[PDB]
Scaffold this active site. Structure first.
Site, short mmCIF file in Angstrom:
data_model
loop_
_atom_site.label_atom_id
_atom_site.label_comp_id
_atom_site.label_asym_id
_atom_site.label_seq_id
_atom_site.Cartn_x
_atom_site.Cartn_y
_atom_site.Cartn_z
N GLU A 102 1.06 -0.90 -0.18
CA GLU A 102 -0.18 -0.10 0.07
C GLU A 102 0.53 1.37 -0.09
OE1 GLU A 102 -3.89 -2.14 0.61
OE2 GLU A 102 -3.48 0.34 0.02
N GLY A 103 1.72 1.15 0.66
CA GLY A 103 2.82 2.06 0.62
C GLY A 103 1.90 4.02 1.91
#
Lengths: 199, 199
Positions: free
Chosen positions: A71-72
């Site tokens: 997702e980051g």
């Protein structure tokens, strides 16, 4: 049945997978309008989201680690590809149902909290389509949360689950195409789910 | 933009594919509530249905023949597996937006009319993800109408389209599983789309 604001973030992340990996602001604005107008149940029902108790296993800390990885982390709210304001690990609705907006800021410990709510439908979904897979469904949870309930239910990968666990492990690799194209993040992601599929 | 009752049947059959092959009365009742309450655009937007001009080819009479073959002619309205009243070739909304109800009756020439409206989103969808495939996308149209926009956009089958047309033809076969199980109708259906894929 009993509406809860927790479930808005959940219906939306479920919708995000059913919509092929992203939401457009059009969808979110439409669905928030429905929710305000008709109630959370009408929103969940029209998309096919059956809100969920499953005493089978829960996403372990390491499962969340790779989910987080893809997702980051974003410590400030940013406008995503689809135009929806987004923060943390892909979060667009806080557990209290309010929307991520321009200006919001977080920490990693905040963002992982909202992520657990974001994902809280995945284990129920995993339960209904699946044998207890001990605690190496942390790769499957990362898989279903990315790919969606309908996708998992039609997968050749599910066929070999219920028991060729080796073809399943190789099936992760095939899901790398989007729009006819090959996506480096996907095989990158697929790799880490294939590999984590082997304890 | 400009709402038309034609498009209700279309959003719903698009939703039917995105919902894994069937609608529940829950979805239909929810979505009719949204449509009455918010307008057709809010319904189409929240599900991700972008209503569609595509001067590429149209579903030929033979394409409709096999589509008809798999839906199954029903000259009287009957309650489907999901509980939605249904008639003809899988039709639940007439082109004037009114619902199929208990008591309705039709002919084949009536039912094929409503089916063409039911399917009228398939060619637009086929256009955006695909080379002009002359007029042997009649097997692809039967494929996308069954399997849905998101499914087609993530397919390894689409990868070999845009140009190994032989692996595509073999890809039809793999889509036979539902709920981890193998479905005789699907391989039966897949077969006839694979075979029709070869003029």
């Amino acid at each position: 049945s009993v509406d809860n604001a927790e479930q808005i973030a959940q219906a939306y992340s479920w919708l995000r997978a059913m919509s092929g990996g992203k939401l457009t602001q059009e969808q979110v604005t439409a669905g928030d309008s429905i929710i305000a107008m008709n109630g959370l149940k009408t929103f969940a029902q029209v998309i096919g989201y059956k809100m969920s108790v499953t005493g089978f296993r829960d996403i372990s800390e390491n499962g969340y680690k790779l989910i987080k990885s893809f997702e980051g982390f974003e410590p400030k709210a940013y406008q995503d590809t689809g135009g929806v304001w987004t923060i943390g690990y892909g979060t667009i609705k806080y557990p209290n149902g309010t929307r991520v907006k321009k200006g919001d800021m977080c920490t990693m410990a905040e963002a992982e909290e909202w992520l657990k709510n974001d994902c809280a439908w995945v284990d129920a979904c995993l339960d209904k389509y699946l044998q207890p897979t001990q605690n190496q469904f942390d790769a499957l949870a990362s898989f279903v949360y990315n790919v969606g309930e309908t996708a998992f239910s039609k997968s050749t990968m599910l066929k070999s689950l219920n028991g060729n666990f080796a073809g399943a492990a190789n099936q992760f690799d095939k899901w790398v195409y989007d729009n006819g194209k090959l996506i480096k993040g996907l095989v990158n992601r697929r790799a880490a789910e294939k590999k984590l599929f082997l304890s």
